[PDB]
Amino acid sequence: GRGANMPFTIMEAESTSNATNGTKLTPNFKPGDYAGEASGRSSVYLDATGEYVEFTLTSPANAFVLRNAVAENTTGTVSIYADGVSKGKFNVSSKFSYLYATPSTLGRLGYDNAPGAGLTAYWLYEDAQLMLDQVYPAGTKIKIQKDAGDVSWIYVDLLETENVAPPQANPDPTKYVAVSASKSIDQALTEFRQDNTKKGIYIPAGEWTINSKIFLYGRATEIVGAGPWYTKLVAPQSQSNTDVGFNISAAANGSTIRDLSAWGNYINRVDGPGKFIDGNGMQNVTVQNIWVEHFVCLYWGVNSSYNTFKNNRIKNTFADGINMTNGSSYNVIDNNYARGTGDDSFALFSATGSYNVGNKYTNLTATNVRRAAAFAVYGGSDNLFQNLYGADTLTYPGITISSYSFGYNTLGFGDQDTVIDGATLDRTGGDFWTSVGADDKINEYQNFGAIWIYGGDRAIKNILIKNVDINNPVYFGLMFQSMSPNNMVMQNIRVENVNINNPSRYGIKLVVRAEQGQGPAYGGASFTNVKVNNPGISAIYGEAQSPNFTVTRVSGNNW
Ligand SMILES: OC[C@H]1O[C@H](O[C@@H]2[C@@H](O)[C@@H](O)O[C@H](CO)[C@H]2O)[C@H](O)[C@@H](O)[C@@H]1O
Numbered sequence: 246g247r248g249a250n251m252p253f254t255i256m257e258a259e260s261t262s263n264a265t266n267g268t269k270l271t272p273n274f275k276p277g278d279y280a281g282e283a284s285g286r287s288s289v290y291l292d293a294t295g296e297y298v299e300f301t302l303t304s305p306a307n308a309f310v311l312r313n314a315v316a317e318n319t320t321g322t323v324s325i326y327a328d329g330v331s332k333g334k335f336n337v338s339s340k341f342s343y344l345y346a347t348p349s350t351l352g353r354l355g356y357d358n359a360p361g362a363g364l365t366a367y368w369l370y371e372d373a374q375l376m377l378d379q380v381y382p383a384g385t386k387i388k389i390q391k392d393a394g395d396v397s398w399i400y401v402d403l404l405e406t407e408n409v410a411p412p413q414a415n416p417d418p419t420k421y422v423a424v425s426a427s428k429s430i431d432q433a434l435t436e437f438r439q440d441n442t443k444k445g446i447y448i449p450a451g452e453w454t455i456n457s458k459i460f461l462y463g464r465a466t467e468i469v470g471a472g473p474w475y476t477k478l479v480a481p482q483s484q485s486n487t488d489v490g491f492n493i494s495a496a497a498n499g500s501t502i503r504d505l506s507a508w509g510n511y512i513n514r515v516d517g518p519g520k521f522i523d524g525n526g527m528q529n530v531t532v533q534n535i536w537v538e539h540f541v542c543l544y545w546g547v548n549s550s551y552n553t554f555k556n557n558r559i560k561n562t563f564a565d566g567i568n569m570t571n572g573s574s575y576n577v578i579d580n581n582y583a584r585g586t587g588d589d590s591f592a593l594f595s596a597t598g599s600y601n602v603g604n605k606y607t608n609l610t611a612t613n614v615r616r617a618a619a620f621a622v623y624g625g626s627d628n629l630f631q632n633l634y635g636a637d638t639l640t641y642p643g644i645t646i647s648s649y650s651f652g653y654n655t656l657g658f659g660d661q662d663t664v665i666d667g668a669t670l671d672r673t674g675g676d677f678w679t680s681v682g683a684d685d686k687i688n689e690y691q692n693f694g695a696i697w698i699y700g701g702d703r704a705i706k707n708i709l710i711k712n713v714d715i716n717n718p719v720y721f722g723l724m725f726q727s728m729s730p731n732n733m734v735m736q737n738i739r740v741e742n743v744n745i746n747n748p749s750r751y752g753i754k755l756v757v758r759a760e761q762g763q764g765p766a767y768g769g770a771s772f773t774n775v776k777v778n779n780p781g782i783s784a785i786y787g788e789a790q791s792p793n794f795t796v797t798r799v800s801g802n803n804w
Pocket residue numbers: 336337338340341373374375452477482
């Protein structure tokens with residue numbers, strides 16, 4: 246792609262190809278800012294009746310997602326036109342946006358939904374979904390316009406366009422028990438469990454309440470919808486933060502959930518509940534072509550192995566998109582799209598089996614990461630992250646590679662490579678934590694590069710980063726750091742075929758003193774064909790001040 250191959254096309258409102266009579270925001274990297282939090286770090290502000298932004302379709306489309314920001318505590322409309330003719334109205338809302346903190350309490354980002362004295366609003370953008378009753382061809386002018394009766398103002402960030410097929414029917418009514426107006430999901434599953442000729446349940450087009458955790462047991466179960474634009478599982482929207490969805494017991498290992506969407510009612514992060522799918526220790530489960538929003542996570546694996554997450558869309562969550570922890574091995578996380586997660590979009594946390602091993606995170610896109618990293622790997626052995634696209638992180642790297650234990654029981658990285666192979670990272674990095682007494686100090690925070698290689702309190706070894714393009718990182722391309730006093734010696738850290746373009750500070754930073762009491766990096770890293778182009782200050786910082794760290798310039802480096 247790089248990244249996921251999805252049926253929708255993403256178009257930035259602010260593209261120079263898009264006529265507008267509204268206000269195009271100049272980019273910045275600020276959280277809590279309508280530019281800093283936008284895709285591409287810009288949007289088009291429509292602030293008077295008749296102001297519009299005009300998109301041009303590059304593929305046919307009957308369905309649209311508008312990422313936008315409106316005033317706090319408001320709902321309303323904005324209009325959509327096709328070739329100059331009005332065609333409908335998006336339902337725009339800040340119900341799920343505006344999370345409050347202060348510049349020195351970004352650790353609270355995502356947790357606190359109420360305004361208050363001295364509090365700044367963050368997480369300002371949200372989405373509106375709309376299907377039209379015609380497929381419009383490539384080349385159609387799709388205008389987003391603020392007409393009389395629409396919201397007082399709106400920031401238009403991007404438009405998703407998609408040509409959605411008609412809904413898919415029950416694959417076989419004699420094998421899939423249908424949910425219906427008078428038969429709930431739970432009742433359909435009970436009928437399935439008690440009749441061995443059934444393969445599962447079918448959930449038709451519609452909106453279907455999920456007001457509970459729905460347990461899958463008995464045997465492997467298929468849950469099949471009509472398509473994610475059609476089958477909508479809906480948490481009770483007059484409630485907030487209800488723990489609903491599916492919970493897969495061991496008897497239902499081998500289950501499949503596919504072709505549906507799930508619309509949670511979380512308005513802030515809660516730690517514990519809030520994963521759409523629970524399946525601790527689950528095996529051989531397939532989750533495919535589902536679209537999930539407004540949960541804490543899609544899935545949080547715990548010693549869960551041989552599972553497949555494929556073709557999913559994870560948007561506007563309050564913590565991680567997918568995390569696999571504590572022994573989870575041999576999983577296939579392939580061709581998934583995340584936008585707006587509230588913590589690491591795709592993560593792997595290895596802990597004591599000794600390691601998470603054999604996982605393949607492939608063809609993944611993670612953008613507009615509202616806190617933490619697009620991709621994060623915490624220890625493990627023989628795990629592959631391949632063909633990644635990451636962009637527009639609010640606070641942290643595009644990719645975190647970390648041997649910090651976080652107080653859990655872990656060995657760190659193992660004896661087989663953790664591989665990052667093929668990745669594009671656009672405008673990644675950010676500010677987090679504190680930097681009291683730090684070297685190379687530019688503000689009150691620690692400052693994170695596009696890729697952070699962090700030796701923590703456990704082994705940091707066997708890391709291969711290759712075929713990566715890092716474009717306009719907030720601060721640095723590659724950032725290497727060792728936690729003191731542990732000073733774990735980094736071994737077999739190699740970087741190959743990497744382009745670092747226009748970093749504002751340095752192409753490569755060896756952290757010398759992140760904060761009081763901390764020191765420089767231990768071990769070394771090798772660089773082959775690593776280009777640093779137009780750095781703001783210099784190509785590499787920290788080399789002379791890092792006497793325990795050896796930079797090896799194998800060949801092909803312009804620094
Ligand atoms: O009050 C429930 C939600 O209403 C709006 O969203 C609509 C949603 O219910 C769904 O079924 O489809 C339509 C069309 O895509 C949505 O507009 C609000 O936007 C949402 O915030 C509410 O929770």
